[PDB]
């Protein structure tokens, strides 16, 4: 059961980190009115 837990923790941490650092990458500038 520990291997499943470590796999789930790895996957969740990866996706949450991707979300967090993606919304930190100047997301407001990604609009069609940006010049």
Partner 1 sequence: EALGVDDGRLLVPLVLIPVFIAILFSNFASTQDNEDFFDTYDQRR
Chain positions contacting partner 1, by CB under 8 A: 2, 5-6, 9-10, 13-14, 17-18, 21, 24-26, 28-30, 34-35
The widest CA-to-CA distance across the chain, in whole angstroms, is 52
**Opening angle at CA 13, ends 10 and 18, nearest 5:** 125
CA distance 7 to 4: 5
CB of 28 to partner 1, least distance (A): 4
CB of 34 to partner 1, least distance (A): 5
CB of 20 to partner 1, least distance (A): 8
């Amino acid at each position: 059961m520990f291997t499943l837990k470590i796999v789930v923790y790895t996957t969740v941490t990866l996706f949450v980190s991707l979300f967090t650092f993606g919304f930190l990458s100047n997301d407001a500038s990604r609009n069609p009115n940006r010049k």
